Design a protein around this ligand. Sequence first.
Ligand SMILES: [Mg+2]
Ligand SMILES: [Zn+2]
Ligand SMILES: [Zn+2]
Ligand SMILES: [Zn+2]
Lengths: 490, 32, 56, 391, 49, 270, 120, 70, 46, 49
Amino acid sequence: FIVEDDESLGHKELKVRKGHIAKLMATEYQDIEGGFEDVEEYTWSSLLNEGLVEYIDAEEEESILIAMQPEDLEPAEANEENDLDVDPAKRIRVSHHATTFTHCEIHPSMILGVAASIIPFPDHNQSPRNTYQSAMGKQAMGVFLTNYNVRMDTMANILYYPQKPLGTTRAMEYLKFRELPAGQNAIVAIACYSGYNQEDSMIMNQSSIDRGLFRSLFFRSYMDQEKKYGMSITETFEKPQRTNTLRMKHGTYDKLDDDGLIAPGVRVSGEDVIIGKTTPISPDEEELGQRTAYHSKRDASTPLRSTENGIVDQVLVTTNQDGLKFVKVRVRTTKIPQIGDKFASRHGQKGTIGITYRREDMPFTAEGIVPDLIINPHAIPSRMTVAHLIECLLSKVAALSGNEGDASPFTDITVEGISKLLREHGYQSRGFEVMYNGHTGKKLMAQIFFGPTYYQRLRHMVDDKIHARARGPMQVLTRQPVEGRSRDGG
Amino acid sequence: FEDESAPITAEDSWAVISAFFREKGLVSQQLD
Amino acid sequence: RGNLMGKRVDFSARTVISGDPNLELDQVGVPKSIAKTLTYPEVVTPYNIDRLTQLV
Amino acid sequence: SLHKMSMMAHRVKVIPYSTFRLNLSVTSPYNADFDGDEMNLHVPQSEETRAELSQLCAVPLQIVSPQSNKPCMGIVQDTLCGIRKLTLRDTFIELDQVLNMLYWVPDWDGVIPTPAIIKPKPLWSGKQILSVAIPNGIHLQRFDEGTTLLSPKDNGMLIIDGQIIFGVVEKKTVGSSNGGLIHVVTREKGPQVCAKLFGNIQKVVNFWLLHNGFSTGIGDTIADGPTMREITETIAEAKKKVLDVTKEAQANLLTAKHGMTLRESFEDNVVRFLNEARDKAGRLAEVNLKDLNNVKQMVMAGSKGSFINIAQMSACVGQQSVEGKRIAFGFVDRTLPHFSKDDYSPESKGFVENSYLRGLTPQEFFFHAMGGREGLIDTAVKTAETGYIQR
Amino acid sequence: FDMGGYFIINGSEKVLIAQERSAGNIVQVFKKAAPSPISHVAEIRSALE
Amino acid sequence: MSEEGPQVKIREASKDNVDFILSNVDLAMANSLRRVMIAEIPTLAIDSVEVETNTTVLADEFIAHRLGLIPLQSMDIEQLEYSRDCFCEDHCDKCSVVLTLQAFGESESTTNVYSKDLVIVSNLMGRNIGHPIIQDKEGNGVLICKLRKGQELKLTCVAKKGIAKEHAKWGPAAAIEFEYDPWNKLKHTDYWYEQDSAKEWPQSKNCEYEDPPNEGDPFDYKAQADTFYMNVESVGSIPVDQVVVRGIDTLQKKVASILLALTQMDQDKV
Amino acid sequence: MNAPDRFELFLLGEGESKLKIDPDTKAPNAVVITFEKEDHTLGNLIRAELLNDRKVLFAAYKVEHPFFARFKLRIQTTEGYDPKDALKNACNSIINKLGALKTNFETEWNLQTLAADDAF
Amino acid sequence: MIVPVRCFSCGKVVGDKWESYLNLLQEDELDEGTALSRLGLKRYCCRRMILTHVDLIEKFLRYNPLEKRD
Amino acid sequence: ATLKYICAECSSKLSLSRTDAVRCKDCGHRILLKARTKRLVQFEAR
Amino acid sequence: TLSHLRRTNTPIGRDGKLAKPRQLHNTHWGLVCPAETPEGQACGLVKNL
RNA sequence: AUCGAGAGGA
Ligand SMILES: [Mg+2]
Ligand SMILES: [Zn+2]
Ligand SMILES: [Zn+2]
Ligand SMILES: [Zn+2]
């Protein structure tokens, strides 16, 4: 923003006024509505050309003096040292220090990146936690595009029911997180329990998994095209015959079609062949003709990955730029949460499932509400992440009152406001609830911090990591075992 | 009054930010 | 340093870990899918013909 | 695999669900947690190597390590909190739950201890049921600052013939300490008995804690109004002292400390004052906190808590620094374009008045990010430099 | 919802990562190590853009 | 633990809630009844799905899961055998109900395919089972999927009898409240507080049915948990009253099975 | 991958008896009974009832591992009184009380039907 | 993508309340909380389910559905 | 039978055969999604 | 996707030197994210607008 | 298959 002394009526005041904001909102609504009549069609360029905002480079911003917020300009702060707004629940903000302001921040929290600006209350966490969350928000499972069905991408992961957060920052409207969210709201209980969430692991309600919690789709597209060589040879799709080819793979060819492809809807598992392709190549010997007639053909099929199974989603048959037949086969499968899977909130709190408990075995409140997670209380003190608890509280209040909780970084929403709202909703101000053991049904002598919160299902599922071997393939040079899980390496 | 006075408040800067992201977008630098 | 001082080995497994308050200190939990891949060669002696034959 | 204990021999137990499962007390040796860690399994292929693994590398034989004379395995988060809460003086147990606790100890000899309270109601103390897990013939005589065989604080430990007699059980006793229960039992009854003790204590304490419960909420970081005002006055006094030092330095009346020029002496005085302010505010908050406060309970149990965390969550976060020096004038004579040039005030050079509960202003947020980035870079460098030194 | 600031090459989608560099046509004066026979050096990476 | 024991007092009743005070019974029995209502009352649900054709947006697993989660009438479930206890070939009329869903985009606007469109094609033999539970005021069931003009979906859903332990989709209960001792007289709970627990902790709605503690009265250390307040809510597949009655039946059956096992072991010992 | 079928929680497997009574050598007249395919729902009930018998000296249970739907119960009665008899009496008392509860609930709901028919 | 059936944690059938919820929001101009209460979503376990749902099916149904004339 | 190869951005059911041009007859397009199978797919509603 | 399309990279640190660069300089205020930076060798060398 | 590069994880 530009700060000028145009206000001869008083102290140096911001250049932008409420009329400009009114016209901007009018332009927004005119875009939303019909009957275009917004002659004063302000956009960003209108503000830029009108002399209301700048484009300040790091080199130019050395010579200026910026105000953190428009309130820093009011003469009252400069002069009125005494005021009744001594709410002890608000941040201690330094007073008005200067009067030669040249510009004013459009808003703090625009200093954050795309992955950071989806953190609720990042200013209540500590910076390492924020960095961890920014790194782990790119692994959260969610809908990356609406046309994922058309795209034949390899390794696409999509949630069954992606849910919008109950605590949303104000930049999520520009990042479109609320339109393509990556995660789900889970009723988390920060409790010490049977002991299976003792380290950063966690407990998951099994009956919540059975009803569709954190279920995700997985897509994997296989590709194969007829080889370029057309000079008296080629490599064509077909269904190889046990009696007319070499080293034909150990998998099942019974699932293929006459086209060398599996029809969509077939259930493929293990190392079954999905694309049937052979090389009618040498040995070009008439002795082979005396033997199996087409013995010259050598199998070039593509089997499923040995550690994967699913159902053929879609088979695409096109021709590459060179005109040779080109094929893509997509296999989809549902990846339900298991014990070894990895989840995390928006505060760098990693954790794998430790054990799943059914709805009856979980602790329950006097209202029957059972948690979808039980997080060990020992993750908080060392990592702090106060934003986690503030987000759980704000989310509880938002779910009760039925609206969105503004988790913007540098707003003026204090824990005491949220607590007052929660108490108005007939609950304990700080979010504690009396729970029952479940096994015995007796009250727990401790009251459990209960409420919703947004958790993300990351990548790194255990079934993609589990690997054992004993006397598998070996190398050729050193005669040691090969490396790689996909190759059955040691 | 409002047109020429009533200075901006904290909540009003989000109209400006929305205008910026409307005209520019999140990948404006590469396209430009 | 990559083929003599250290090398890939057979009869080994890797996977995520979890916790079990109900496991002995020296005891570990091996998933069935892993215990059915790794093997131990036992010699047939008159003390274990029956059990080893049953395993066969 | 930094040391011996990162390679230990275990006994197998085939289970479902695709993850290796470990006892929670062996995590510290491997330095493992369950946030996504993975481990490698190796199977011996000969009776010779099976015997070598089970007679040399066996986990119970590794409890007391030659690195420091003290145990490696100890008692960890949930068991630590549960054992400190269970052995409190006010924790009595009914017959119905005591029967389950006793049946949960495999070594239990079938003899029900006579309750500590008999006539009005039969109530067993937590120390009794925990002692049922301690083998006979074990003595400890640890005395803390104010332990005199009658102190009301239980700040001590006395065991006579495998019976907790006095004191709370916490990280100083069952944790991997120099002369705790673990070390004494290993050096007295042997490795197998100590591993069995690990199992028994874990089982009993986990059962009790499951049927009691224990949580942490946002209400654990809040300090009442009076202590918040006291913290604010402490911080204001520190700010005033720093301002007085600044006035003295700007008047040239400050005398440079020998071995340091004027600027370094001034910066040292300011950083010392700010650190004293943070410590005083943190102590005020901590003494305010009740025993109800779950964070303070974790701190007292030794179960992953420290008082610096309490200070930073419920009071001033404190001065930030990069390269050992308070934030530097990256711009021309100012740390950030929102401050006037040549400003040495605490707020302009990294100090963070607020707490994490209360929030951070944008400048404090950025300075804290600076400090966090410094820490992360240091960790990344060590990750490899220490490995090279090891090799 | 696709922003679209990328290329499609052989089907695959590629992103040109902004390569950071020190500016040219700026005079930078910096101190050389004392053991060296040079005290200060002023450096320009002059370029006709 | 004598015969003429537990007494009941139904505070209020609906068709999706039964609110009652359960008194003169141990806490173990109350909790066991709660757990049984949650976990071990058989009901009907879709178990197998044969997708004849599906050009819709949703995948086949998605729709199969949704269909499994649709409640179905289960008043007469006790007259249906378990598919594991039948001699048929993967289903028949006496151990399953066969529904079939067929939808198409006749209209150019979005077509809402939903559980009103499920039709039972098997023979129910007069049993009161198989009907999807439609409680919507619009008469519309549970939204299953949506269709463009050309999209189609043909299914064959086989309904089977099961308990919530095998899969949560067979649960007859939605959520069971449970409380005892509104005023913490038994001191089974210690109240976390800052300045005053009696002010910081909201008063339970059941505190009106109990005498407030007397400030001077000594702690009645001989008192035991009793007079449990419960509120069973039913997803609609079974009436709430029948949910509770069948929970009691299931506990009785489990204990009777224990007795029968003891008797069989004794007979084997002779 | 390694997830066992959910039916293994309540369906007996091959050669898996419902009960297995093993006399306990730690104390006299004490036996340990293992219930297969059972959990706390019945174990807590049985133990709580057994503790109401004045001829029972000890009664405790434990589910050794949540992975396996198993259950172990220890009973130690006074001299003469066979622990199996104590278990039988426990089950019989439980059944009687459950039947009484069902009868009372049916009676109360029959009374309430007048309002229920007018409810939703 | 579609409104979830059978609320996760508790199991209440919140799948038939999407249409009614939207109608109350739009036609009756009710707030989210009042609309949720009017449908009987007593406890936040279900209010989060209905409230924070993202109906992506409406966006998938914009692409041509392998249809004879579309 | 040779029923197969539904066309993309169209609806034509090509039912091509070996050596047939991969182009769609009346679209000129070259994608030709392959005709979801005929055998019933068995799913468990879980 | 959005983060990748708005990423940068500093070839200078590819040498692996351990020094004052690859730190959050305070001239970065409002120009690159103070929190979004990878771990390992690239911490502080890869920066996000 | 090979080699090279990048991404990320413990
Ligand atoms: Mg870790
Ligand atoms: Zn049948
Ligand atoms: Zn619900
Ligand atoms: Zn066409």
